[PDB]
Amino acid sequence: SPGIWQLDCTHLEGKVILVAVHVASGYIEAEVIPAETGQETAYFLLKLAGRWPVKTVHTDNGSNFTSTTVKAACWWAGIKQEFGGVIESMNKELKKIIGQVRDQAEHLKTAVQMAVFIHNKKRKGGIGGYSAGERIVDIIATDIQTK
């Protein structure tokens, strides 16, 4: 549960955005990639797995996610792949924020990182509200203590 991620590709302004969502927290990481290829997807995964404890990734049957480069990265990093709606709901919120801040950036990739920033740090409103960035840190912290 602490290491379950959903990955998918979305498209804006002719560019390819690779999105990773931590399922249990809603925390997201996203970046424009130069092409929707397995080579770029694998490099994305190696970065992600070196920063968060990635144990399982859920993707569709896209060619980039079934590539030999991605399967090798998952073998090297110890990631289990699963090709069987949190990402769609969270990505709809990412597209919402990208449109909010689009005029603040020249390049789309800059707006994407601005939107990722806002998404992960925006606290929930009421009593005891926390952000997605705070939720994933808490989830990983408690899993480490229960060694």
Ligand X SMILES: Cc1nc2c(c(C)c(C)n2Cc2cnn(C)c2)c(-c2ccc(Cl)cc2)c1[C@H](OC(C)(C)C)C(=O)O
Residues in contact with ligand X by the rule CB under 6 A: 38-39, 42-43, 46, 67-69, 72-73, 76, 105-107, 110
Binding of residue 70 to its own copies (CB under 8 A): no
Name the nearest CA neighbour of 72 among 39, 102, 97, 100: 39
Exactly one of 68, 82, 83, 124 binds its own copies (CB under 8 A); that residue is: 68
135 phi, psi to nearest 5 deg: -70, -45
- Does 103 appear as a known binding residue? no
**Which residue in the set 12, 23, 77, 86 belongs to the binding site for its own copies (CB under 8 A)?**
77
**How far apart (Å, rounded) are the C-alpha atoms in residues 127 and 105?**
34
- For Mg ion (CB under 5 A), the number of binding residues is 3
60 contact, one of Mg ion, ligand X, its own copies, none, CB 5-8 Å limit per kind: Mg ion
The two three-digit tokens of residue 98, written as one number: 């990208």
Task: Specify the pairing of strand 56-58 against strand 15-22.
Answer: unpaired
Give the chain's largest Cα–Cα span.
Answer: 47
Is 88 within any annotated ligand binding site?
yes
Please pick, from the candidates 12, 15, 24, 62, the single residue that binds Mg ion as defined by CB under 5 A: 62
Run of H or E including 62? none
**Binding-site partner at residue 8 among its own copies, Mg ion, ligand X, none, CB < 5 to 8 Å by type:** Mg ion
Q: How far from each other are the two terminal CA atoms of the chain, in whole angstroms?
A: 14
3-state secondary structure of 71: helix
Residue type, 39: Q
Based on CB atoms, which residue is closest to ligand X, 57 or 136? 57
Task: Select the binding partner of residue 108 from ligand X, its own copies, Mg ion, none (C-beta < 5 to 8 A, by kind).
Answer: none
For residues 7-36, which are near Mg ion according to CB under 5 A? Answer: 8
